[PDB]
């Protein structure tokens, strides 16, 4: 993806967010950070992964933007300069959205292979059995040397 498409895509995904709420320079800053770490030009397979992380970081910057200003710590207002009176009572709204977004990554890109390896059962596949068995660093139960080593007990996991 080029530098101009990412701002176009992020703004649409964030419900048409405006420039003052989030500048185009900040989006490039997070976009560039994941470009150098994932060398997207070298391997184009990380386009969905780099795109998903970029949006999440932008939401994080939005939350901290409410902080460091007076918006986060106020929950009341009252103006009265005569006959005009106004009283109203997004920091908390951005919170659960970030939690919700991390649970539905398909909203960004459906090809993220999300939710595929929840349950793992060991010893029910030949591919997984031999990979563990043939690992030279593996130490299993058949290596119990006891008091002092004896040649009756194997020193390697793999079968001869």
């Amino acid at each position: 993806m080029t530098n101009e498409q990412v701002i176009e895509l992020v703004r649409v995904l964030l419900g048409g967010i405006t420039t003052e709420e989030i500048s185009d320079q900040t989006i490039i800053f997070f976009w560039t950070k994941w470009k150098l770490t994932y060398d997207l030009d070298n391997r184009p397979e990380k386009i969905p992964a780099a795109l998903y992380n970029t949006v999440v970081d932008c939401v994080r910057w939005l939350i901290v933007q409410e902080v460091s200003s007076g918006n986060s710590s106020i929950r009341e207002r009252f103006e009265k300069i005569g006959d005009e009176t106004i009283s109203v009572k997004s920091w908390e709204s951005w919170k659960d959205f970030l939690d919700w977004l991390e649970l539905n990554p398909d909203y960004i890109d459906p090809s993220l292979a999300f939710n595929s390896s929840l349950v793992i059962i060991g010893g029910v596949r030949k591919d997984e059995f031999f990979r563990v068995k043939n690992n030279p660093n593996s130490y299993n139960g058949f290596m119990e040397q006891g008091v002092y080593p004896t040649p009756a007990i194997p020193k390697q996991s793999a079968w001869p």
Partner: protein, 146 residues
């Protein structure tokens, strides 16, 4: 930290669910056809695209639609797990092969064209013209649970 894995799926006796045993011989059901094993351009390294259960024509060229359907490739040299043939054949090398045609019971779920598409009604009636019971009453199509 790769953990090398090998795998296989299916057998010979799951694409052919049953035969009609002609007492007089044993070659009644089959026909021997000659096809190109390794791709015509790929080096002498590529495992060919002849997975058992592909539909081939009368002259051995792999099928692409219901028109060019004659038989089901069941040769032992392409059964799952039989993969010691890699460099044994040069590109364009042409070898005999075995097709099953007459008096056979065929699994509808395994038949495919060369591209990968599953067999359709036209292909079913084409095959069933040769006297093959193409059936979908198979038990075992859901694994373990997940």
């Amino acid at each position: 930290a790769k953990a090398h894995v090998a795998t296989l799926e299916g057998n010979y006796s799951d694409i052919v669910l049953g035969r009609v045993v002609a007492f007089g011989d044993t070659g009644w059901n089959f026909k021997e056809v000659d096809m190109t094993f390794i791709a015509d351009d790929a080096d002498a390294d590529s495992k060919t695209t002849l997975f058992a259960g592909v539909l081939v024509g009368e002259d051995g060229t792999p099928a692409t639609a219901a028109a060019g359907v004659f038989g089901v490739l069941v040769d032992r040299k392409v059964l799952p797990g039989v993969d010691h043939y890699i460099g044994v054949f040069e590109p364009g090398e042409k070898v005999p092969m075995v097709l099953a045609v007459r008096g056979l019971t065929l699994n509808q779920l395994k038949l495919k064209y060369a591209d990968g598409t599953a067999i359709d009604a036209a292909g079913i009636q084409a095959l069933e013209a040769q006297g093959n019971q193409v059936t979908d009453k198979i038990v075992g199509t859901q694994f373990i649970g997940s």
